[PDB]
Amino acid sequence: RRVVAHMPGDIIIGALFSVHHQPTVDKVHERKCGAVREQYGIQRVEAMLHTLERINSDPTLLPNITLGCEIRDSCWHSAVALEQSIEFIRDSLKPIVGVIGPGSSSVAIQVQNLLQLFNIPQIAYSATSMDLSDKTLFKYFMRVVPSDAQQARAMVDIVKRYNWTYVSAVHTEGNYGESGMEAFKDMSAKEGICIAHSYKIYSNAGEQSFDKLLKKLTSHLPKARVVACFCEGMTVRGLLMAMRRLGLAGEFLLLGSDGWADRYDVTDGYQREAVGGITIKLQSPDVKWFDDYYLKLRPETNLRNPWFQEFWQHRFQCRLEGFPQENSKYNKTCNSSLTLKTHHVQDSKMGFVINAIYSMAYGLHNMQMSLCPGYAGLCDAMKPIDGRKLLESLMKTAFTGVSGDTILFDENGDSPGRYEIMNFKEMGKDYFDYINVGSWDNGELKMDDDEVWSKKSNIIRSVCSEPCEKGQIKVIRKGEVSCCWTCTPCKENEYVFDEYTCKACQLGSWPTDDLTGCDLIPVQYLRWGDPEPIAAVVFACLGLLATLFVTVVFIIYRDTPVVKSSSRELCYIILAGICLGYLCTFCLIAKPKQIYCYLQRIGIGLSPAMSYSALVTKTNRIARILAGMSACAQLVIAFILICIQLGIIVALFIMEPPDIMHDYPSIREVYLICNTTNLGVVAPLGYNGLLILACTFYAFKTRNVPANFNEAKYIAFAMYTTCIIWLAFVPIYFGSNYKAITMCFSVSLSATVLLGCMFVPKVYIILA
Amino acid sequence: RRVVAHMPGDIIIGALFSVHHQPTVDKVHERKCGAVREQYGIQRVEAMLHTLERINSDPTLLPNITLGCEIRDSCWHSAVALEQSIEFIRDSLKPIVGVIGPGSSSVAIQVQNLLQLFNIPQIAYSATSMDLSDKTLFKYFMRVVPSDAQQARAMVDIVKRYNWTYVSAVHTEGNYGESGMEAFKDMSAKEGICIAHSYKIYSNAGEQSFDKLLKKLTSHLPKARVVACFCEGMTVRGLLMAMRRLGLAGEFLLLGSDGWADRYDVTDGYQREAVGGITIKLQSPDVKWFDDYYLKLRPETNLRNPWFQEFWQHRFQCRLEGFPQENSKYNKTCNSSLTLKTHHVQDSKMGFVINAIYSMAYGLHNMQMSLCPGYAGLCDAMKPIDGRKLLESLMKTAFTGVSGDTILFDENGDSPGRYEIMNFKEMGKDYFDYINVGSWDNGELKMDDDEVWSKKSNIIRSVCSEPCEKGQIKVIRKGEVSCCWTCTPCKENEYVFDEYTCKACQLGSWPTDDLTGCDLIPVQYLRWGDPEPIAAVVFACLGLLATLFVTVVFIIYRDTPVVKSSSRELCYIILAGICLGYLCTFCLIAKPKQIYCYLQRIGIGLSPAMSYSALVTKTNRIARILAGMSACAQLVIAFILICIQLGIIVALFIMEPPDIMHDYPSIREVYLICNTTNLGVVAPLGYNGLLILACTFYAFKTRNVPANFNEAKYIAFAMYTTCIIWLAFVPIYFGSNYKAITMCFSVSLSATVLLGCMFVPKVYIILA
Numbered sequence A, B: 001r002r003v004v005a006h007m008p009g010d011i012i013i014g015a016l017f018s019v020h021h022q023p024t025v026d027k028v029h030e031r032k033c034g035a036v037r038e039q040y041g042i043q044r045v046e047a048m049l050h051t052l053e054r055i056n057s058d059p060t061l062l063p064n065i066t067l068g069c070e071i072r073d074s075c076w077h078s079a080v081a082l083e084q085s086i087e088f089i090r091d092s093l094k095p096i097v098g099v100i101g102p103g104s105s106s107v108a109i110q111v112q113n114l115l116q117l118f119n120i121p122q123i124a125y126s127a128t129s130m131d132l133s134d135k136t137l138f139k140y141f142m143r144v145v146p147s148d149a150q151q152a153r154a155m156v157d158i159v160k161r162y163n164w165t166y167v168s169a170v171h172t173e174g175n176y177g178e179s180g181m182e183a184f185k186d187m188s189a190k191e192g193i194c195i196a197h198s199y200k201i202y203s204n205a206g207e208q209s210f211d212k213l214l215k216k217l218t219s220h221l222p223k224a225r226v227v228a229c230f231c232e233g234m235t236v237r238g239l240l241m242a243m244r245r246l247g248l249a250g251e252f253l254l255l256g257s258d259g260w261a262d263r264y265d266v267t268d269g270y271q272r273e274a275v276g277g278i279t280i281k282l283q284s285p286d287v288k289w290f291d292d293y294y295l296k297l298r299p300e301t302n303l304r305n306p307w308f309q310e311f312w313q314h315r316f317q318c319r320l321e322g323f324p325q326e327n328s329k330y331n332k333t334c335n336s337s338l339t340l341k342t343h344h345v346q347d348s349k350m351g352f353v354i355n356a357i358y359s360m361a362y363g364l365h366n367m368q369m370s371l372c373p374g375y376a377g378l379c380d381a382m383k384p385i386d387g388r389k390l391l392e393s394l395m396k397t398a399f400t401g402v403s404g405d406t407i408l409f410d411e412n413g414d415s416p417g418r419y420e421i422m423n424f425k426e427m428g429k430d431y432f433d434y435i436n437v438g439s440w441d442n443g444e445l446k447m448d449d450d451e452v453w454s455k456k457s458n459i460i461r462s463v464c465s466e467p468c469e470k471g472q473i474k475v476i477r478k479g480e481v482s483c484c485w486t487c488t489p490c491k492e493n494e495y496v497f498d499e500y501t502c503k504a505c506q507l508g509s510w511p512t513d514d515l516t517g518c519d520l521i522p523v524q525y526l527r528w529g530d531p532e533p534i535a536a537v538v539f540a541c542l543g544l545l546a547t548l549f550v551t552v553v554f555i556i557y558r559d560t561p562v563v564k565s566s567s568r569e570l571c572y573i574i575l576a577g578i579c580l581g582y583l584c585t586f587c588l589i590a591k592p593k594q595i596y597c598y599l600q601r602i603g604i605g606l607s608p609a610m611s612y613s614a615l616v617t618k619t620n621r622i623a624r625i626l627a628g629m630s631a632c633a634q635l636v637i638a639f640i641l642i643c644i645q646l647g648i649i650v651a652l653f654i655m656e657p658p659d660i661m662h663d664y665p666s667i668r669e670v671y672l673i674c675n676t677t678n679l680g681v682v683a684p685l686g687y688n689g690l691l692i693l694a695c696t697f698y699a700f701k702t703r704n705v706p707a708n709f710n711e712a713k714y715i716a717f718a719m720y721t722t723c724i725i726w727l728a729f730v731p732i733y734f735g736s737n738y739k740a741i742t743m744c745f746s747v748s749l750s751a752t753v754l755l756g757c758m759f760v761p762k763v764y765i766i767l768a
């Protein structure tokens, strides 16, 4: 029923070219094909018809015998191609020794499933899916083109080079699109790429299907502006027509594939919508001798091609009245002046088709040479050409292609190849073209970023979220695509440990600038400078001057009656304690070290205790003599209890060594202090307070007595005031942080009031 | 060539049964298929051979015409089935009017692609993939079974019923497994299920492939304990063999499908590894007449089935001497006592097979009744049986199946069906069986959770992470599936409002008990009661009593001679001041409101001024008396001094109006006290300090002058004591936030010392 192109020969080679368009979604069941094709149709048919005659004319290839062909139309449809393939193998049920496989991957799979049953090798020129690399299922299938694994790698490289992270995905329903999108999704989601949503659609889908697909694509338009299309040319054209219908004229960047390549028939009429698209095209130089033969073809003389008259009518819209094919649908006639030179575009994969035919010829040549080296022709051992031997010879053959490079097949039947990255641009006014803006070879992507985006303002990068590495802010993911995150700044206490978590530093520590890491907060100590410490040391200096003056005035007047009243040694240890207190004041405000830290503690424990014990063991005799031991050796009765005092601090000392803790009152600052604790400091103060209570009780006992210049009342008043000076600082000491300056002040004031109200009257009048 | 089973008839019906096993991975190219099958092989062939004879015998169906058949072996392989299908259509190049399609989905697709080119209806009994529902690509395909969309729905229902979330997935490479797993993935990822990893493998893959697959499965073993297998019976058997080999004995839960169903040939020998697995099986009642016919078959008499001798020798391991198919591999001979009744198991999908055949017959009948109603037989308008008419009659035919229900086809060529959920359990010792533990019909999943997991301890649910929603802890997702989360506690300041983020209360609130919502922690005020305020109130009461007693004494003893030197009005001013102080302390300790601290400030200002202003001028007069306008100048001096302080207080109030602030010292607690500043509490305090200094200077001037019982000495005692108290409260005030209670104490103590050192000599002297 369907027509076929013949060429007589001793050996017949089949061919499946999509001369006509895929049947519409209505007429699929009738299996009637659409309009004729030029690039994928007549050009390839003429290419095969001419290359066979070139081979036949060549004496150095397939000598003494001729190569024929039986070219059939597959209409880019699996059913039509399967029917034509059945027509191929009808003889096996002149035999077809091999076919030049169809262009579509799914169609090639369908044809191979039938052909491998009859041992008919099949060489494809544009079938690209990875599924055809499985030699277990597709043993009799070979390619002159690489698989789409390299194409998926190239697409991922392109999306990676341009910061594209949040893209959408579209692929044509079938085997090429499906496998390509699976490979792309795998190797993209592996590295860094996030897909907004993957869509699939048939090439022959209606207008409504493409409209719905474009609406779904636009649902993510503000964020995902890049659409990775592992789609055929017709799918991309349908997308462009949908864009035109609903007024989208540059909101998307279409990233095409080998299906789009640099085809002018997929952007014609809709150039404005496809501008800025980036496509991948298998590298194949133009074939000059094909152009020299094709452009001189005329319908009157071209009889061996059954589709040439229809193509001539369809291209130059006209009617060939003289010939049986007229097609009066075209109103005007064709004058003998129209030529194929005008608006001639040679298809991209012409080299591949010629290479496939040459490959089959060379395989046949090798097999013939191997079988009968002597005979020049078809030997008796070659009349029943075996498909297995031909396949074996083809799998190892190597030759020189039309381009000039070496064509050879690997273990999977594929062939080496490199890609060109083309960009659809507007060059002039009302002029669009495909510009070669890069290449991809074995993982090396050499792109040129000046022709595409001839400026710094490129396409808005398809990113879900802006880079959120701005200082404090971290990144959290809400379960959806790991590229759509939300930004939360975390507390100044913590610093970022990774991009998704920030952790806290140690108890005493602060994050560094920009929270890159963590540092140690400097320990700010009580300095020898500062207002309060310098005031304290001034106080201590005044105190020392007072003590030395009083000691001098006592040494001058040793045995005077106005002095020799009580034990003189008690009124030596009192001044000793007074001096030691101010020595403690000096020792306290200092860098916390090992020696100073126990020196200050033993001093605080020992000084006021000694002085006030001396005062008590003076007043005891002083008032018991008038109320009704003593002698002069009361110094002992003091010392022993003072020794007890010493002993108890020994008990407190042995438990707590004079170390330094690093007090942390807040997260911001760090302080260092002595090893003094509540238990270690409340006991000596408790003992001192008991002594104070006894002294106060007994100063009350004596109060007013007639003595030498009335010491008793003044010392009682000093005791009274000291009792409350001690208590004043208690709230701002127990639990506070400045307990050192308070200790210095308390000791200073206590010493001053004790010295000023017991010594000053007596020695003052003595000097006066 | 391959052997086929013939049956003469007027109309021939093709059939493709997997009589032999799938060719091994090393024999695929030769297309030599393996050992014979019983359930999927001989049983189905015998079923068709007997069903056709039943139809021929039946006069009410297809009268006056006999039904023939040409049964061929597909070996469960696409290539072998395609070869057999080519042999079916070889006449078109007695015609085959229709085939009973193969069992596999991919094999059925391959056969349909070829059959639709010749208008040959194909009815499948077990092909269940969704892809075969597309009537555009598979117009001539019908089935008596539902698609696997319902099966994926059933699997998702089962995984969601037992709260399996982090399941793993395996499917057989092909069309049934692929489509089933895509459907399951969609339907499961939609609701709440996550897939640890999806794996694919061929049925005839080697031991190494299954070992690698099982190692990858065990890589998630502790967490992903349930495996959803959209796998064929042979894939499940291979998984079981791997489990036996590498020592897995029941730490996986295999969730089978229609491929597994309740097949005993996938768990034979490896029952221990498959125990506990849950499978889905299409419901099909056992056919009784088929059992009656089948169990009486003998190799001697059964000649029409060419595979019966081989099957007989394979099943009972023995050699048949009396027939050409000796197969001397087996040692022993076959005695005339072996019967098929022993260990007989009828396959699950037998009724479907019968139904398919019946459906075809019925359709033919209908079409005949539609074409030639009068003639009984094959009318002249029916000799070239038309595929389109037969398909159209099949698509609308409805009849009664062997089960008893009504078989009919919908618009997609499918048929209604329901599923049984079976469980592989161990009944006794060394005895395993498939137990019907549930069903699934049109979305309703009935199950028996007591039969599977007899105890409450079921299989450890496949969960990637334990429920983190308990208390303050929060869920954080990493860069992987959303069913695995890290459980991290966020601080007690924050409350969780969403399961993936928690936020802190603004300034003065706390999270509730449920950590859902801030609670606005209550404010704390001075709180009438408590020990300290009660003591303060007691002191205030004592002071008021003292003031009233002194005033009563003063007003009773008006112009007594001893009280004549001191100014009466100045004493009145003093008493008024002390009374105002004791009222101000009462006012201050209370709930803070506008009016309260509107006058508490003027109290704290005036009352000390009211007293000390009078006292200073009194002392000035008493000093001028000794050193050298009585009352007239003193009152105006008091006037101007009190007025200057009143003006200062008024200006401070005007410049800084009082408002009840809600100061927040920390996040934990909130306090309210009406606004005060450094100036607001220093300027009046500084003024009164100047007053105290002046009073101290003057009463030092007078010191111990002879007077009425030397009131100067009492004044000196008063100023000493007052200065001491004022200096005493500095640390507790300026070091802590207890402003109110310390102010109460200070005011009360100053007032009481002024009331003690004065007016006590007066009262106790004038009393005598």
Ligand SMILES: C[C@@H](NC(=O)c1ccc(C#Cc2cccc(F)c2)cn1)C(C)(C)O
Binding pocket: A577, A578, A579, A580, A581, A582, A604, A607, A608, A611, A685, A725, A726, A727, A728, A729, A730, A731, A733, A734, A742, A743, A746, A747, A750, A751, A752, A754
């Ligand atoms: C600050 C603190 N005060 C003291 O822990 C303290 C310790 C020692 C002294 C003293 C003294 C002194 C007095 C006179 C002569 C002399 F040699 C020494 C005062 N306060 C408390 C109890 C919280 O008020």
Ligand SMILES: C[C@@H](NC(=O)c1ccc(C#Cc2cccc(F)c2)cn1)C(C)(C)O
Binding pocket: B576, B577, B578, B579, B580, B581, B582, B604, B606, B607, B608, B609, B610, B611, B685, B725, B726, B727, B728, B729, B730, B731, B733, B742, B743, B746, B747, B750, B751, B752, B754
């Ligand atoms: C807590 C603080 N005390 C006061 O801010 C203060 C304010 C007023 C008074 C008083 C009084 C008074 C005394 C006698 C009669 C009278 F009517 C009033 C005391 N202290 C300081 C100075 C740190 O001690």
Ligand SMILES: *[C@@H]1O[C@H](CO)[C@@H](O)[C@H](O)[C@H]1NC(C)=O
Binding pocket: A160, A161, A162, A163
């Ligand atoms: C984003 O692309 C730019 C060039 O367009 C370049 O900085 C780099 O390839 C990408 N940036 C990063 C951080 O990788």
Ligand SMILES: *[C@@H]1O[C@H](CO)[C@@H](O)[C@H](O)[C@H]1NC(C)=O
Binding pocket: B161, B162, B163, B449
């Ligand atoms: C599964 O569903 C929820 C999980 O929290 C629970 O209420 C129920 O008891 C679980 N188990 C079964 C057998 O439904």
Ligand SMILES: N[C@@H](Cn1oc(=O)[nH]c1=O)C(=O)O
Binding pocket: A103, A104, A105, A106, A126, A127, A128, A129, A176, A231, A232, A233, A234, A258, A259, A260, A349
């Ligand atoms: N690469 C495609 C072939 N191809 O698809 C088109 O749309 N044009 C074209 O040449 C395939 O592998 O099927």
Ligand SMILES: N[C@@H](Cn1oc(=O)[nH]c1=O)C(=O)O
Binding pocket: B103, B104, B105, B106, B126, B127, B128, B129, B176, B231, B232, B233, B234, B258, B259, B260, B349
């Ligand atoms: N629906 C299944 C049918 N089936 O698969 C098996 O492995 N056994 C069996 O009956 C398929 O499409 O393959």
